[PDB]
Design a protein around this ligand. Structure first.
Ligand code: FFN
Ligand code: FFN
Lengths: 146, 145
């Protein structure tokens, strides 16, 4: 077992959904993590997700980060379909009861929203990456601290 | 103007209806449900037709009105969605006020109904979305509990 600073905000979470199966929070040691508050049916999310996917494909290795979907979907089949087409990780559907309070904790007032977190400490690096990705597509100023 | 709905909607004048606009004053003496919703939200899309049935049966006899408060940002979605509904709507040009209205009543998800006395603006319930399911004949309307 390995600890994780993400457990500061996901104390009920252990595994994340991934394209390789499941990954522990501990597996993200040393990384920058983006919590991506989104939903399958939200129109502005539909416009943003491909932009974030392109950024992810380009930079996630060289800039040592992961993206974890935090979905507002309340329908499990919709959740899996939506996440299936993304390239990154997801908080499992069985954590859906925590999503509202997690949004409140980070001052999420609408979606899409990105919250940038240090995986080791749980420190919030930034809250504006949803726009910075568009402003800075090659991530010159990543991870966009204030 | 004088109605207690005006305390919540200071930038509004009129609400949309099926036959053109109506004043806030036209709701004098009514129980009013503020219906926090969005055209693309699945539980809303499932609840709207249920609420429509409830409205059609009871709105006259139990002297209430429903007012759509929509999270829609796309005007074509708004008009189409409100087109499914028999009741009133906060006009699309007031949509910038929807979030603060949600915060006024502690709306933390949708669909949500907030029940208000129109004249005084008093909140008389927050659980009507649930009560409509359990009590579709409105025996316990307006559900003080
Ligand atoms: C399209 C859309 N869907 C959703 S699902 C949840 C939200 C949302 C709204 C307000 C908040 F304070 C937090 C999330 C939200 C939103 O803002 N827009
Ligand atoms: C489907 C859906 N859409 C929307 S659009 C806005 C909301 C929402 C979310 C959180 C709040 F505090 C208020 C509204 C919301 C929601 O909760 N569910």
């Amino acid at each position: 077992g390995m600890g994780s600073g993400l457990a500061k905000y996901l104390p009920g979470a252990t595994n994340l959904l991934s394209k390789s199966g499941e990954v522990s929070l501990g597996s993200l040691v040393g990384k920058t993590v983006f919590l991506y508050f989104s939903a399958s049916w939200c129109p502005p999310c539909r416009g943003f997700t491909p932009v974030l996917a392109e950024f992810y494909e380009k930079h996630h290795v060289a800039k040592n980060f992961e993206v974890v979907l935090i979905s507002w979907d309340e329908n499990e089949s919709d959740f899996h379909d939506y996440y299936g087409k993304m390239p990154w990780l997801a908080l499992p559907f069985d954590q859906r009861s925590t999503v509202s309070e997690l949004g409140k904790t980070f001052g999420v007032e609408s979606i899409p929203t990105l919250i940038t977190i240090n995986a080791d400490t749980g420190a919030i690096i930034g809250t504006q990456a949803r726009t910075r990705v568009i402003e800075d597509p090659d991530g010159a100023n990543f991870p966009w601290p204030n």
